[PDB]
Amino acid sequence: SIPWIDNEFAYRALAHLPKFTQVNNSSTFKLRFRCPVCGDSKTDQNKARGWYYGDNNEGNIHCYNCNYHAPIGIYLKEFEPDLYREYIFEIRKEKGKSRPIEKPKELPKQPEKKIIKSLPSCVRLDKLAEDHPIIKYVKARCIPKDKWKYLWFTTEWPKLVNSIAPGTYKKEISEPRLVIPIYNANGKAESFQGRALKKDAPQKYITIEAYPEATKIYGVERVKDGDVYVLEGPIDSLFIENGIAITGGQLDLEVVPFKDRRVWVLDNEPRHPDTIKRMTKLVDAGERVMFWDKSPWKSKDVNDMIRKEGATPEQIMEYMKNNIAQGLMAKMRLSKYAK
Amino acid sequence: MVEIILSHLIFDQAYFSKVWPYMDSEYFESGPAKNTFKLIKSHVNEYHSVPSINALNVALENSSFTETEYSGVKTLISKLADSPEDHSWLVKETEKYVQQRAMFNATSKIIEIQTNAELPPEKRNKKMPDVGAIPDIMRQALSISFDSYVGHDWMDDYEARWLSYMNKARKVPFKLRILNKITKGGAETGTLNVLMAGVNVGKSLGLCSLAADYLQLGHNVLYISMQMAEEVCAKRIDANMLDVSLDDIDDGHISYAEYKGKMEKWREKSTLGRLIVKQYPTGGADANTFRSLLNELKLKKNFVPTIIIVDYLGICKSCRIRVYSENSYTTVKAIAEELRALAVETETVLWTAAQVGKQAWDSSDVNMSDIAESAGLPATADFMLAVIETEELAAAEQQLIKQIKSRYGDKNKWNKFLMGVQKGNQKWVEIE
Amino acid sequence: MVEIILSHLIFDQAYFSKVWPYMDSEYFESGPAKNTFKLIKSHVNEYHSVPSINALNVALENSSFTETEYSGVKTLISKLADSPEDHSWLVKETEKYVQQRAMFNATSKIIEIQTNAELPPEKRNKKMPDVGAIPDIMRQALSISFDSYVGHDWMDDYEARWLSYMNKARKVPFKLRILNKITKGGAETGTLNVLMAGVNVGKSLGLCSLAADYLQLGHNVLYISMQMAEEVCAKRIDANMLDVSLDDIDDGHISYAEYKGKMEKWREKSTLGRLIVKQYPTGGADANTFRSLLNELKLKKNFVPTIIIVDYLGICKSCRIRVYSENSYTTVKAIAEELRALAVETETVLWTAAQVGKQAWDSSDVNMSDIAESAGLPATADFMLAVIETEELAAAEQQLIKQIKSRYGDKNKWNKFLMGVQKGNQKWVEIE
Amino acid sequence: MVEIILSHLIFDQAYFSKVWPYMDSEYFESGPAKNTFKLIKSHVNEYHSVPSINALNVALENSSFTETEYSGVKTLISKLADSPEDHSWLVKETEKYVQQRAMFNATSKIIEIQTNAELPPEKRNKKMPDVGAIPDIMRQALSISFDSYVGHDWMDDYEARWLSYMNKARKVPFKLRILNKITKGGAETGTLNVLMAGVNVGKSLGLCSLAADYLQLGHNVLYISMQMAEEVCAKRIDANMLDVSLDDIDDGHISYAEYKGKMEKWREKSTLGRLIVKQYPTGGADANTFRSLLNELKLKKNFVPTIIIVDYLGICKSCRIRVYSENSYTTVKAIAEELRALAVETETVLWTAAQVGKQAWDSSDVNMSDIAESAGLPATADFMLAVIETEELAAAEQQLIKQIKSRYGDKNKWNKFLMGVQKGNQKWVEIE
Amino acid sequence: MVEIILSHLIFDQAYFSKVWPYMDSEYFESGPAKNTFKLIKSHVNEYHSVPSINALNVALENSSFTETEYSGVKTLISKLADSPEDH
DNA sequence: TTTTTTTTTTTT
RNA sequence: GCCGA
DNA sequence: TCGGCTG
Ligand SMILES: Nc1ncnc2c1ncn2[C@@H]1O[C@H](COP(=O)(O)OP(=O)(O)OP(O)(O)=S)[C@@H](O)[C@H]1O
Ligand SMILES: Nc1ncnc2c1ncn2[C@@H]1O[C@H](COP(=O)(O)OP(=O)(O)OP(O)(O)=S)[C@@H](O)[C@H]1O
Ligand SMILES: [Mg+2]
Ligand SMILES: [Mg+2]
Ligand SMILES: [Zn+2]
């Protein structure tokens, strides 16, 4: 196919549609829009189910509201016959010639730009009194005290962010959150996560990046010799020696260092097929993945094991060190464990 | 070492002429290597030669790949270059890599097979073999080698042909001299023999006659019944070897004292083996089940089989094709393949019986184009017979054997012969 | 289910008497289950009996493990209960667990073998086998079915076989001398028999005649009316038993006084049994529906059918196959196999009729090949009769029954015999 | 692709002299490509010779070009190499590029024509073609092919056809004077031939001999055998080639020393071809298979055959026919058609055997009507030789060969001939 | 009353022997109850008998549905319990 | 790839 | 539509 | 109340 022309024509033919948004991440080109086939919902104007994905080898317009998935050419034929003919002609026009899109291959990225120096409205956990409510909550979390020097407590999280990244929130409503600063390899904070307190925070539990190129892996500065264990929760990583945690919905293997010795320690849910998908994509790369297939505990995360089933960190480490499998060996445990 | 293999596939000729036919797209990773091999294979198909780097660049430009795929393939091709090396290490290392990557793919396949097996019905998909097929696949992968024998090459393979001339395989003799004559001394060990016939005309009768003859010949016989109880098959064998009619057994004409006396007279005979009859429900046993039975017979009863005899081939479970998944031809062909594999493994002269098509019933002659469940049996079987007792052979108390498929001798020498099948004694005699 | 396996090992003798032969420490786990089974194995080795919970705890105290293993084994031991579940389900489930864990172990073993093979000979481990052992390692892991039975021996079990011969409890008489004579004691339980005939030649007439004959012999008969209605079938049965020409019945030649007298006279007989007739819509009943009917019968009334007669097998609808999922040959043979399985489950003679293709609907003789439905029906069946009627036979009121397929006895001793069918009475009369 | 085309125009003589007549300035681009081709055309026009790279650079030096155009042309000129690509792929790829660009140009032209049409007629371009000529223009787009060879054109290829006549480019001799006499030079390539065996003739023997004679002439032969084992067919080949009687091979009269000596003596001769025997199960080989076998032989053994002898036509399988029978007219007709299609597409001579009726058996004279597979095989078989053996000819060690159907020559010229058949040597010799 | 129906389907031979032939999958729900009845029906087909709670737990462990469905079925089975009742 | 009904056709 | 806040 | 989610 011709994905770049597909993206260009999709942008041309979807910009005028209401609730259009050109969501362009460094590897993905997507368009959000209210689907003209269905119209989505009057309440769900911003919750527009019309999506276009052009990052694939072909451009596909999919709407989950009316369940309409189709190639971009079909949409052009059904809605923009003039633009349809334009696209269908120009695709053949450039089809004969060699693809030149690789010629302007430039990187607009930048190095550390918003290096985080100090945290207003934040008091570190080890600096707090033993009867602080957050301290009691983390006692319930059973986090070892020595690592409390890595977590802060705040009450002005929107204010803190707008002091770091102004304009994030139109209102700086005071909000207590657990600020977990995410540092780089050299030890300087490149982002920070406002972990929700109590059962759940009111809104917007998100990790605020200092800049788009900031790291998403927590604890990299504390990585020592030996195998590196990759987990899903920074608090969970706090229970793991040489344990880093990826912070984000995107899982890129290239950005994660220690290709030789990185070990993926994921959740203990054989169900939740997205987990199985992640496991499969990791094993297809021949990566080192830990398997909970022989775990005596049946909780979800390591901290859950500790809190609910009374697991101890040493048991966790010995299970991880004895349950690392790679290649076909990993695939066996993956296959048996999934269901 | 995929880069080296591709480099010497492109920049070398002798390496290609030696290694190309065995290469396949399944032997490379899903990244740039597989796409490069796809382009190379497409060019070779289209022009019958190895392309040049410029040709590969042209094909890549005129290809439907992703930006990542296009960049990777271009980078790999740019990395390709001729490394001057010896034409002895390259071939062996390529063969090693092809075997290693064949085994990885095979293993992944058996893992997928097990995953499919653990799936519940309906939800589980198809076009994937059953768990029982897992060993056979693992046999293929270990057989991959760059020395392929495709056919007999006259003036090139003359040592093997002369060896086949002078030497002859060991034969397990029958007790009927007619079968020895039509098999030049007997049946070879690692063979799947079948006694085809019509329905209720003597499939199991012939199998039991062979079982009784082989028991009298001192071999160790296992009779696996799928349509008859153990008592029924053992009664057939008793009728054959004690010269007592089944009517006499059912009516009780022979006294238990005489029965015990005959049994002791047979037991005191030194040249006697042990025949063991095992029953499984119809569709409840497969080749794996037969292997488990052999294991327990070697352990529990300390009995090593020599003549495995299965009552009905078409009844047995495929052992490799999920039950009620494919058609009849594929299922029965897989059954025959599994049974022959077991026979070759255990070095036992296996016997079974297949059912002819409805056209052959009550017909004075049958042939290969009459097998009901699958016509693939003669391809798999090594010695097949027929029974043509239609209208007047029974009235004359005789039989007729077509010798449909004979891998031991020339089937068109004694193709049709008459056997005096005695139904009351469940035995075969010779008309001479 | 490891906890269940250990609990039923400790607190059951029957389970231990059939699953301990097939048990290895490599099956269960590398955790507390492994050490618990090791304790069980040690306790049975030192003293040849199954331990107790107190004995197991004493053994654990005597044995040495790490604190974590100690706590885990103790916790598992505390979680053991009798729980006297079903035996069949228990053995089947533990067999499935053994097979799956054996497959997992074999696959891990071959993976380790390949991993060692990739290593340099100096670095690699000599203890593991070579790659050539990958196939057999799989098949030995596919032959671990739970089956301790080796079967008969023909030499070490001749007395038991003679005792089995003496047990004629399988045979059921026919109330007709000719049928019993040609079946050597009549039909047997769980044995499918087919009385095939052309359209409007007397299939259901013969089936109702057999139902009446079995009723006069004290059995319990279940007549499954596939085409007619309940009242009509009962009318035919009355025509046979109450000896009143079916027509007379509709022409008032039997007064209600005489009908009541005959019915009460038959009720007074102590040798009379029970006959239940069930009508079913065409293509709406089979082994699943038949077993539902069986359970409903056994609950509503103290009725256990000794004979199961099906009005026509072709009218039935296959259990697994949909109404017209596949061709006639697959679905009808599936129905035949399901009915035979139902018969062998309930240990009842299952009679049914079959239709004949148009080639023999007016022939003096009908052969086995002339089965209108699947040719698998004259393969899944046992005692097959064919009913033939011509102008001369109709004038003589004598249907000709041909012993087309005879599993019970000699198919050629009396192949064709004239029956004395009186269509007015729906009765068969032997001819002397 | 433009860079490669320009480079091989500059630095080649055969490719230029082949592809120049079909190159136009509008085929390439509106930029560097068009200007470079304009320079090439100008140089080849002013001086009737392909410019050199420095000549092209000089032409660039003295020409009307803009600064950007000058830089682009200079860079492209410096980017021209003398890469020695293969010829066939280069021709095919440049033809594909030319056709694609011609299609793009024609599509753009018709689109611009339609755009011009939808304008006020007072304000339009007169030079633009009218709409009614649009189907013609696209035709000119598709009238672009570098090599215009579609079928054999009479009066335009009389020289090539005469060269084929004189060179006998289709015939393949038989090593027997009689066969070449009755075929005007032997059998022809891309043809099928059949031997009609009579009452016991041995279909294998003749195909065996021809196989040999074809071997002694240096032709690559492949004997796909069905009713025989590879060793048996190769043994017949040995009998024909080494002058050793077939039964002597079985007895052992000829020793290993003499056998190996004769084999090496034959190997010393440079006029000896290669024979590849491949076996297939009876009825398990259709024509399509043979195609895959040829692909494998060409790819792996580099064996490109010119003679393909299949053991038996009736034993073969139809390529796409579900119903199979031992002797059916539709099957033999389909098999003959498919085998002849295989022969045509492979440019190879194909031989097979077939059986005739009993009327042909009893009578020495055999008519095309007196053929079991008449109308069917006669229709698709280029050559048909009825091989008949009579008792008098058996005593004289001869056979009566009759040319039943000769697409090669007149039937009656030399119809019947006595052939010196030696059954033990499996050899055919001429008769003085 | 699906919980009661299942509880007396398991812990009662008399109730089962009557109600089972009429019972079918489409009679309970689209949630846990349907899956529990599916497991019960599968076991009944396999062994011609009512499974115990342990057998149902074994079947649930060897099942394919999601974590939500698994939790629902486990909760229902744990909530299954015979009570003194009349036929 | 078998398998069965029905019809239609054709060859021996 | 499902999930997260 | 928001964003991100395969076919
Ligand atoms: N008890 C018996 N007494 C005498 N002859 C019998 C007896 N049982 C079977 N036969 C004969 O055995 C012959 C063939 O029976 P089988 O051994 O079943 O042959 P078959 O080909 O295996 O039949 P199948 O298994 O149903 S396809 C029939 O023709 C009967 O005459
Ligand atoms: N009520 C009746 N009165 C007299 N004769 C009858 C009666 N019912 C059936 N018959 C005769 O019985 C023979 C067929 O009847 P049935 O056995 O009921 O039919 P069937 O054997 O089920 O076969 P089909 O194909 O279903 S009609 C024929 O000779 C009929 O004339
Ligand atoms: Mg039998
Ligand atoms: Mg009827
Ligand atoms: Zn929509």
Residue numbers in the entry:
A (entry chain G): 3 to 341
B (entry chain F), C (entry chain E), D (entry chain A): 1 to 432
E (entry chain D): 1 to 87
Quote the passages of the study that discuss this structure, keeping the authors' original sentences.
The T4 bacteriophage gp41 helicase and gp61 primase assemble into a primosome to couple DNA unwinding with RNA primer synthesis for DNA replication. The domain architecture of the gp41 helicase resembles the bacterial DnaB helicase13,14 with an NTD and a RecA-like CTD that are connected by a linking helix (LH). The gp61 primase is composed of an N-terminal ZBD and a C-terminal RPD that are linked by an 18-residue flexible loop. Here we report a series of cryo-EM structures of T4 primosome assembly intermediates.
We hypothesized that the absence of the RNA primer density in our primosome EM map was due to slow ATPγS hydrolysis by the WT gp41 helicase. Therefore, we utilized an inactive gp41 helicase mutant with an E227Q substitution in the walker-B motif that abolished the ATP-hydrolysis activity, and assembled a T4 primosome with the WT gp61 primase and the ssDNA/RNA primer substrate. The gp61 primase region achieved ~4.0 Å local resolution where the pentaribonucleotide primer was observed to form a short hybrid duplex with the template DNA that was absent in the WT primosome map. Interestingly, we found that the gp61 RPD rotated around the HIM2 by ~6° away from the ZBD to engage the ssDNA/RNA duplex, as compared to the gp61 primase in the WT primosome where the RNA primer is missing. Superposition of the gp61 primase structures of the WT and mutant primosomes shows that the RPD moves outward by 4 Å to accommodate the ssDNA/RNA duplex in the mutant structure. In the mutant primosome, rotation of the gp61 RPD caused the ssDNA template to rotate and interact more extensively with the gp61 ZBD as compared to the ssDNA in the WT primosome. Interestingly, the 3′-OH of the primer has passed over the catalytic site in the mutant structure, such that no additional ribonucleotides can be added in this configuration. This is consistent with the predominant 5-nt length of primers synthesized by the gp61 primase. We therefore assigned the mutant T4 primosome structure as in a post-primer-synthesis state. Indeed, we found that the linker loop stretched and became ordered in the mutant T4 primosome bound to a completed 5-nt RNA primer, as compared to the disordered linker loop in the ssDNA template-bound WT primosome.
